[PDB]
Amino acid sequence: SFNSRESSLADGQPVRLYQFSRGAIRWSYNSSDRDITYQNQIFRTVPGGITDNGIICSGDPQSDQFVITAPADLDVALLYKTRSPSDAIDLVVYDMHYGDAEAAVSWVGQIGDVDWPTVDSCRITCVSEDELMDQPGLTDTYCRTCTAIVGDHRCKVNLVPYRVTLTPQSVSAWVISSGVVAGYADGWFTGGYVEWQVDGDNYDRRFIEQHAGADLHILGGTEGIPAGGQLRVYPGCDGLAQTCDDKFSNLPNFRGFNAMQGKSPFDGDQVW
Amino acid sequence: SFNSRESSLADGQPVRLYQFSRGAIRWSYNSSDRDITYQNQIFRTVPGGITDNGIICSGDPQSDQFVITAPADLDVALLYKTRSPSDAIDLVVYDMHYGDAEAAVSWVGQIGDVDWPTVDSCRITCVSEDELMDQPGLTDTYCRTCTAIVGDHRCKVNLVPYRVTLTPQSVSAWVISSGVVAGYADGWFTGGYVEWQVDGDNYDRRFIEQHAGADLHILGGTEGIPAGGQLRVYPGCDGLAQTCDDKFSNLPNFRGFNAMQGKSPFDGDQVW
Amino acid sequence: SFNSRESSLADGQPVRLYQFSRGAIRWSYNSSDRDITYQNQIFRTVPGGITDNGIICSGDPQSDQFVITAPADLDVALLYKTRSPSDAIDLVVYDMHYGDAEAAVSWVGQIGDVDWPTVDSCRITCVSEDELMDQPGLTDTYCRTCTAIVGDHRCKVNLVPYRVTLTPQSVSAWVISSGVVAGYADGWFTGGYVEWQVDGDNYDRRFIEQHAGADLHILGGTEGIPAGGQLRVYPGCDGLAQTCDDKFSNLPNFRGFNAMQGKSPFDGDQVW
Amino acid sequence: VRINAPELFGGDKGEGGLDGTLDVLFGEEDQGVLPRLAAMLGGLVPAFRGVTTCFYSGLVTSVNPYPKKWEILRRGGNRLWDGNPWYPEKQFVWLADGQIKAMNPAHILYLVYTGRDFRGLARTRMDEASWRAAADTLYAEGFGLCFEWTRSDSFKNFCETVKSHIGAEVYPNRQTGQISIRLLRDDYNVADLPLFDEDSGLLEITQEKTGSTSLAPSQLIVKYIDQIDGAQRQIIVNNNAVAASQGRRSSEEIEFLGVPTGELAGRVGEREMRLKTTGLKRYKGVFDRRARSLNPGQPFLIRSTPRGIPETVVRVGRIEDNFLGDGKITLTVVQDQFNLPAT
Amino acid sequence: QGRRSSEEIEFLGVPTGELAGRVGEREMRLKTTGLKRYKGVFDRRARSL
Numbered sequence A, B, C: 001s002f003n004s005r006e007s008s009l010a011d012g013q014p015v016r017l018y019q020f021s022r023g024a025i026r027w028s029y030n031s032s033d034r035d036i037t038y039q040n041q042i043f044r045t046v047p048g049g050i051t052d053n054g055i056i057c058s059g060d061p062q063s064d065q066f067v068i069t070a071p072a073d074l075d076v077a078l079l080y081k082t083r084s085p086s087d088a089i090d091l092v093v094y095d096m097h098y099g100d101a102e103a104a105v106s107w108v109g110q111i112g113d114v115d116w117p118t119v120d121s122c123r124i125t126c127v128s129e130d131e132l133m134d135q136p137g138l139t140d141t142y143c144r145t146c147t148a149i150v151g152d153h154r155c156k157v158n159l160v161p162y163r164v165t166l167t168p169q170s171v172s173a174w175v176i177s178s179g180v181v182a183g184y185a186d187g188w189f190t191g192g193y194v195e196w197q198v199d200g201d202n203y204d205r206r207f208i209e210q211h212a213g214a215d216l217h218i219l220g221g222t223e224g225i226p227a228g229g230q231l232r233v234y235p236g237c238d239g240l241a242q243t244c245d246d247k248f249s250n251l252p253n254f255r256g257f258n259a260m261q262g263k264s265p266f267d268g269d270q271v272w
Numbered sequence D: 001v002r003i004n005a006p007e008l009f010g011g012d013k014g015e016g017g018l019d020g021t022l023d024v025l026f027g028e029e030d031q032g033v034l035p036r037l038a039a040m041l042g043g044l045v046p047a048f049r050g051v052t053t054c055f056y057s058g059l060v061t062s063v064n065p066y067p068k069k070w071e072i073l074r075r076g077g078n079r080l081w082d083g084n085p086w087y088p089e090k091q092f093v094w095l096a097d098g099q100i101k102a103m104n105p106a107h108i109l110y111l112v113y114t115g116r117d118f119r120g121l122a123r124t125r126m127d128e129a130s131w132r133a134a135a136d137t138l139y140a141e142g143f144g145l146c147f148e149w150t151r152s153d154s155f156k157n158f159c160e161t162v163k164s165h166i167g168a169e170v171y172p173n174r175q176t177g178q179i180s181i182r183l184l185r186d187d188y189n190v191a192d193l194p195l196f197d198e199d200s201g202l203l204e205i206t207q208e209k210t211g212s213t214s215l216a217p218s219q220l221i222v223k224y225i226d227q228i229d230g231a232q233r234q235i236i237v238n239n240n241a242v243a244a245s246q247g248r249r250s251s252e253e254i255e256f257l258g259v260p261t262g263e264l265a266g267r268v269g270e271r272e273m274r275l276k277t278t279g280l281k282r283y284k285g286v287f288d289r290r291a292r293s294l295n296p297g298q299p300f301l302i303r304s305t306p307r308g309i310p311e312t313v314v315r316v317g318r319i320e321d322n323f324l325g326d327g328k329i330t331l332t333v334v335q336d337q338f339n340l341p342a343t
Numbered sequence E: 001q002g003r004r005s006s007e008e009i010e011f012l013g014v015p016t017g018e019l020a021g022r023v024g025e026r027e028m029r030l031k032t033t034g035l036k037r038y039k040g041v042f043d044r045r046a047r048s049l
């Protein structure tokens, strides 16, 4: 009846539904003045209303953004206030008419940017998957180092054995200290990242600038790190062939070119 | 008195005249509420009025367009509704004051684009000859083929003996069939064009995708082709030297380079 | 108290002062309705008021202009009406509150452009020193000529001995004639400039197209040259090494490359 | 200079070698005319002052008449500055056991601004304190660079490249009128920095720019040139945390040809990665006269309880103030996340 | 001028140095004479321009 209602000249009762999902956690909002139950999901009513500006599909990712307006107290947007969540918040938009149990999917995407122009409002800019095609695609260089992030699909190195679970001893503004890591050689954890559970099955990740003794340096500060929460810390690969094989014994998968050639052409001037 | 009237502070009676000409056919329109006779030419009065936006001469062809506003039923603009006429409609604009027999030429150009934003109006964009200087001017390539359109001033081939006048047997959506052409070898007419008289001394031209037996394929469809009108069909040149000389015996004027050189430099690496 | 007054919620009495300086001559203006004395300097009140549009510091010289609006009879701006003064008019902007003897410097720059959109107003565009970084910085070419303006810090040639002080005999639209220069060889003054005192310690400079006999050709016309005022005329250097040494004996400082090499590479094809 | 290599290309049995005498004229202020050059060339021979020139005479090749192209390495920086070097104690930075004599970028910018051969601005127009502090900090960090001028472009392009390499802002001070340089480093005390609040000089904050984290790169490729040999080299910087979340690999290439050592390139690449993947929060605040003395690059604190924004450190960006008329002072600020690690 | 300033202009079409200097003098005079630009509004008397 959704299509029939759209074609109807007197039963038009538009209502737009938004679904923000991050793994196992979902946030449901509706633009009407009362909650709507759809597919066993109830959508909350935001005091003040939630509205968008329209959907544009012109083939230009930079121009085809989707804008959401909502109060500054919106739960899903509140997360971005202090620090952007590590994972992207997928957004799905449905369209349905009051009194009908059928809805149609209109827009699908993820959060691109969030800002709070006024205390009584917040503007969210949503981007589609098409915008991820503007970055280069070379991803190849003939250099000495590995040119591969430890654990990627190219290194084929399993980090689960190297996982270390610990409770930090003391947390400071920029340094998190723990005695368990003090037993490892300096720089063992350099290049690794720290992941811990925020809510449900979602974890927030932070990279490590440097590891020295019992003190760990966290890039961008330690804000948001629970002082007593359980933390998982993985090591980091420098990328050198000696580092790759002595520590991880992954030399066969070494993607770097240590000593094949640095400059030698076959159309130079004098070989000697 | 035209200049005197322009300088006059109390006799200003502006009236703008438009003259659309296509060969032997002329269309005359005026912006006033009554017909004006000038140079033995009477200009019709369009119910609703005809007006422009102004004349700009800044040296930039892209910016110095001339816009005409007129009802959607305008005769000259009605031609563009289905398909653009093959020939360009030259436009000349005169300026005169009511009661005076002298007029001054203001703008000269041709139709650039036509659109019908509303049922009660139509907007015509007129371009000047200066805009034709944006396209490249290389017009030269060292390739095997002729690189010349059959019949151009470079080929110097007379197509009048090859003209064929015929009445089509059957006309379809995309194919025009005639038995007379069935007596020619397949591909004889490929690359040619069909011209027929529309009105007066003006003809509309259509290119031919392919010729096979008794059926002719027309690029862009056969819409606008009269089912019983007289049609003139010319052949087409493939551009190969063998094709040029065997069929037309125009080898001396052959502009192509068949076997002079494909890559051979005089500063290469090894001649053998 | 200036900062205290700015922080004050009830004593806000803004007043903006402008100081146009050119060497030993200063012009003082204020935006209020009465003259203000500051640092023993009294600022005139312009009938009609003087106001700006705001200060922008975005790091882009093209965009961070400062605009001044004032009547068309403004004394400082009146100079630009006929010809731009040779020297740049430095501008300093102060901020002070009525009743307080302390002021704060806000903007510093020089006149960039002046125009008179209306008889009752004039708009002045002021540019900062950051805009002078858009021009190239190569300033080096391996050519035969000197590539140095006579008298610059690179030529190290003292023009004071060559200074000639004279009273012109006759002044025409484009030619200034004097018999004293008639005693010099043709082209002696070619490339030089004429400087004379306009007011105070500021002089206006004009270049010379050509010198022939008793007649001097002035680039851009002779308008603004006093018919009886004292004029100082300096010679000009052609830039050739023979010209540089025979006339000025500055060959050791000759910056040109007469006969070192014109094309000769060390990686060519055939030396002979 | 006695260059002895008559058999470099195998001698007679090969293609020859390089044997001869090389004379170098750097072009000092008092440089004289070389008798040999003028005698050999003849004619009106000037002193060739102000430009470095060399005069070679001897064997170039043998057997074949096709001489080979040459490559010459040359250090510079001291013979510049005309006659008066500025703060020479920190002009050069030594790297790789003295092999690379890098120059302080602050000195490069100072020469470009005040150089008589480049712009010739009066030395009095530059705030000595700020530039000296920047040079001292750069020398302490051992952050040197090498460059060559062949683009013949505007001063703005080269200055922007230098600023991006070092991460500094150059602006004409509104108050004193001199050119000031500020480095983007975490070298500030929280207390002394000014605080702005709704009741302390903040009018309205409109833009929030929450940003996103699922996007942004996971791998960064930095390409640099080694000055020992001049051969292209690159280093790889990885973001394991973001990489794990990313469904598919993403990479970008950034060129820092001014960097002469791989370690320095990695130091700056870590800064770039942290900046681009930490999720900066951008704010567009509106302030009253209390924010009158701020300048570009100056960090300050902002608090607004109704918006739920705690005390946050931000760095000034675009400035647009209106002292007369509307009275609107509007500033654009970004969260403070700029820092150059030393390791 | 307090400090030296220079710009480079290419006139590759010029085959002789004297002609290049002739046009360069024109360019210098144009760019350093301080032209005054006006944006006037006229009635029909300026129709034939």
Ligand SMILES: [Fe+3]
Residues within 6 Å of the ligand: A146, A148, A150, A155, A237, A239, A244, A250
């Ligand atoms: Fe690895």
Ligand SMILES: [Fe+3]
Residues within 6 Å of the ligand: B146, B148, B150, B155, B237, B239, B244, B250
């Ligand atoms: Fe042909």
Ligand SMILES: [Fe+3]
Residues within 6 Å of the ligand: C146, C148, C150, C155, C237, C239, C244, C250
């Ligand atoms: Fe000279």
